[PDB]
Design a protein around this ligand. Structure first.
Ligand SMILES: CC(=O)N[C@H]1[C@H]([C@H](O)[C@H](O)CO)OC(C(=O)O)=C[C@@H]1O
Ligand SMILES: CC(=O)N[C@H]1[C@H]([C@H](O)[C@H](O)CO)OC(C(=O)O)=C[C@@H]1O
Lengths: 522, 522
């Protein structure tokens, strides 16, 4: 007898999407002729008034050579890549067989779908209310599938008690005329305002050099709604060159907690043809030879931004090929010191991570020594007062490097977790420190986010450490996105009990989610 | 002292484009500081009334690691790929420094461009009037370049007496909601109407299987203007599957010269997931196992098209994995037999080209034997009465295979030109015969078009033979497109003195050009 296999997804449910893949179904119809209906029950705690519709789609069959590979779909159903067409299921891949608007907890979805004599794919789509709260959690179970007027056998390969979390697609492919958005940074101001920054990569998703601005989305309601995109840094046709030879990218953002002034640092690349700035920036100091380190500041909680402030000459060794920030965010130290992670390719063309700091509220910056050779993107957190922990993307592969410094980068001490505790596929990763005074657990905690793999950028995960980054217990981890994406992410605390994350996801170029601190540390 | 190097282009000038690349300029400014102007002189026989404007663009500099590679641009200036943005220069890559509308034969284009200390790229854009004639030829020279208020040294690397030809983008990326268009076929009806067919590849440029229709563009004025796109073959959700599991593609079109009935044959692939039909079609006969060979016919000069006629059972051996037409066009023999090239993957998984014919005006069809093993796409021409010449894509690489048959494909003879006379990069190629009475030279001629290379799909060229394909003299050739593209093309005779070609070019997915026969046979 035939069996319907079910795979529940673990990806963000975007509130503004018209479709979100909730379940996939595979039926090899050796004897079945017609699928009549699917019955769904949402969990008892689901807020049904926040759900707009539930839909059953049929997506056809599979290539015969792929029978037996345990696939649950023939193709990706909802594009996150096609400009202007990432909110709804592609109708050429998926036929809407059933839809229920304003559903009850129990949903019957009538298909009456004639089955291909072979593999058949179906899937269930969840659409939220535009009004839905960011803390919504959705659970559901397929109760019954009727085939040829009989109850069909079912087998679920996905784990029990999946928690489906919602999110906001802050930026989608095509938005505001830009092909792509990448490289998130995220902070919370002293006024609780959320500020998320990113590359606006207009022509395609290529790294610098290209037509790239720094964009910024501002939320005054905890990430539920976002003001129209701002452009803190954009160089257009500066210095008489085309805009695509004036990109500025890889932003890092920090809040000066002593004054609430907000700083964005980025790498402005001038010239370099259409080639990658990693290989096209050279020794020197002016815009014709090397990438420029530029700042923009806001003294009004992120609403308006200064013209660019060039600090290259403060901190760049002329012998370096390329000095730029570590993308993501910076910090204010307890003693008021401002710190941005940085990275420089030295005279031998080897990259090294470190930090840059200001003791005068951002007027002047300085770099001492690198933390570790052959490392690039890094994030820094004050794990204990006066102790900066730098967590680094390591070109050796497979795991983050971690070191600490108590003299602002003069000397570095390798940490026990280094090259062991936090696996990576060589990719940006976020690290923040939350102090006992500032969170609902009255405990010092470290939060880290990245693709929890050694190969490929998928299974984006937030991990928590309770012993200052010595131990990252699998118990204290939340897996937000099992799909593939570009992998970058940046964390902040929305408030004393809620984590905010802005990251490159499988469902939107810039995806924002709120995760209760108690969900990850129960 | 500095030299400005000039490379004149050899690509079609699209009449509906706002920009076309005419000249590229490179100036390594070791001494120079400002480029003041470029003076252009159109040839004496150019019709200036058909020229809407000329423009001088600055496109910046080059990555230092690319100096000395003789590049003349940092990037492609005008996309033929980006949906909805293939008609005008990408503004982020090129700054419009000056423009002259309704120019005189001699034109000064100012720049006053401050030069980058290094490589500097400029280019000249040519924009035609929308009502320009397809037969327009544009010749031009750069008479002077002023740098620092002195005449600069010039060196032209491209040949003298380049003839720039206009054309029409019948189909552009994004038109009518389709991401791409591929695989041209072209015929001229008994009433002088031009009919061009192609894949409409809605989602992206992938081969079958995918969401693909056969589209058709019809022109009653020699290809100057084209009627709204028709869809002779489209299967949507046939057989209860999604449209993307019902693509129909690789069209071939022929005119029955005895009646003017027009026939289009294509391959309808049903099911197969989202995989390539080349690997997903299997032995068998019905739509759930193997690609279907389908026809549509028109008895009103291409204005309306019949429902599909499935002829698979007439001609397919069940043991073949895949039987399909050879894309492009077919023919009517002098004796009234209709002939479509075909190709089949046999039970040993090797493709073989051949021909399919009808002796009863297309009601029934037959296939005898393949002409050559490990061959795929082919085109057929009646070189003399009763002698069919099959010109074939050969997987061995490097050159077309050519064989002939006098018994409609029961037996075949390798031709002297085979695997020698016509190089190819393994790609579709067009072949037609124009009989003495039907052209102004009063001689039987063969016309051939393909990428005139052994590697890469570029330098699309029409070649003429005056001796039944025994020799293809280099002087009887016109190179239409030096740029890179998907490479396919199809020829027809617009009238007794004019060749028409529809092909995948570097400037438009479907590009139509008209070439006077005397241009190719002087
Ligand atoms: C200036 C620059 O190139 N930044 C890129 C960075 C860099 O290339 C790499 O870290 C060097 O190893 O990597 C990637 C990435 O998605 O992997 C995105 C960043 O934009
Ligand atoms: C049915 C199919 O796949 N046709 C494709 C054809 C085929 O794959 C190849 O000829 C086999 O070798 O090649 C290509 C090509 O641009 O080279 C496009 C055609 O759509």
């Amino acid at each position: 007898s035939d069996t319907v296999f079910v795979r529940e997804t673990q990806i963000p449910v975007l509130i503004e999407r018209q479709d979100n893949v909730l379940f996939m179904l595979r039926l090899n119809a050796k004897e079945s002729h017609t699928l009549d209906e699917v019955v769904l029950n949402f969990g008892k705690d689901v807020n049904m008034s926040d759900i707009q519709s539930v839909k059953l789609y049929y997506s056809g069959t599979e290539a015969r050579q792929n029978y037996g590979k345990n696939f649950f779909a023939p193709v990706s159903y909802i594009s996150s890549h096609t400009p202007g067409k990432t909110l709804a299921a592609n109708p050429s891949y998926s036929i809407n067989k059933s839809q229920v608007n304003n559903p009850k907890r129990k949903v019957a979805l009538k298909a009456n779908q004639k089955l291909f004599p072979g593999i058949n794919y179906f899937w269930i789509s969840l659409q939220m209310k535009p009004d839905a709260s960011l803390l919504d959690k959705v659970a559901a179970k397929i109760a019954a599938i009727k085939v040829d007027n009989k109850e069909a056998l079912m087998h679920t390969v996905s784990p029990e008690n999946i928690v489906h979390r919602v999110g906001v697609g802050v930026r989608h492919a095509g938005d505001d005329g830009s092909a792509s958005f990448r490289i998130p940074g995220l902070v919370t101001t002293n006024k609780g305002t959320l500020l998320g920054v990113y590359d606006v990569r207009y022509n395609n998703s290529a790294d610098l050099q290209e037509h790239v601005d720094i964009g910024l989305s501002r939320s005054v309601d905890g990430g539920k709604t976002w003001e129209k995109m701002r452009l803190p840094l954009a160089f257009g046709e500066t210095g008489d060159l085309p805009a695509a030879q004036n990109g500025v990218g890889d932003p890092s953002i920090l809040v000066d907690t002593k004054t609430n002034t907000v700083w964005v640092v980025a790498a402005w690349t001038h010239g370099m043809g259409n080639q990658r700035a990693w290989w096209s920036s050279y020794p020197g100091m002016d815009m014709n030879h090397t990438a420029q380190l530029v700042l923009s500041k806001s003294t009004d909680d992120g609403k308006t931004w200064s013209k660019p402030i060039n600090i290259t000459e403060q901190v760049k060794d002329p012998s370096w090929y390329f000095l730029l920030q570590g993308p993501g965010r910076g910090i204010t130290m307890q003693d008021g010191t401002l710190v941005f992670p940085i990275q420089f390719i030295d005279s031998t063309r080897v990259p090294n991570a470190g930090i840059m700091y200001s003791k005068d509220r951002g007027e002047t910056w300085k770099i001492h020594n690198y933390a570790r050779t052959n490392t690039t993107e890094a994030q820094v957190a004050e794990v204990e007062p006066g102790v900066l922990m730098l967590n680094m993307r390591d070109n050796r592969g497979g795991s983050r490097a971690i070191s600490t410094t108590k003299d602002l980068g003069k000397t570095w001490t390798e940490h026990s977790s280094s090259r062991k505790a936090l696996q990576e596929p060589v990719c940006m990763a976020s690290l923040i420190s939350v102090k006992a005074k500032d969170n609902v657990l009255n405990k010092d905690i470290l939060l880290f986010s990245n693709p929890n793999t050694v190969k490929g950028r998928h299974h984006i995960t937030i991990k928590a450490s309770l012993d200052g980054g010595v131990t990252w217990l699998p118990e204290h981890q939340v897996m937000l996105d099992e799909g593939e994406g570009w992998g970058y992410s940046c964390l902040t605390m929305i408030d004393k009990e809620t984590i905010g994350i802005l990251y490159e996801s499988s469902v939107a170029h810039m995806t924002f989610q709120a995760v209760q601190l108690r969900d990850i540390i129960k």
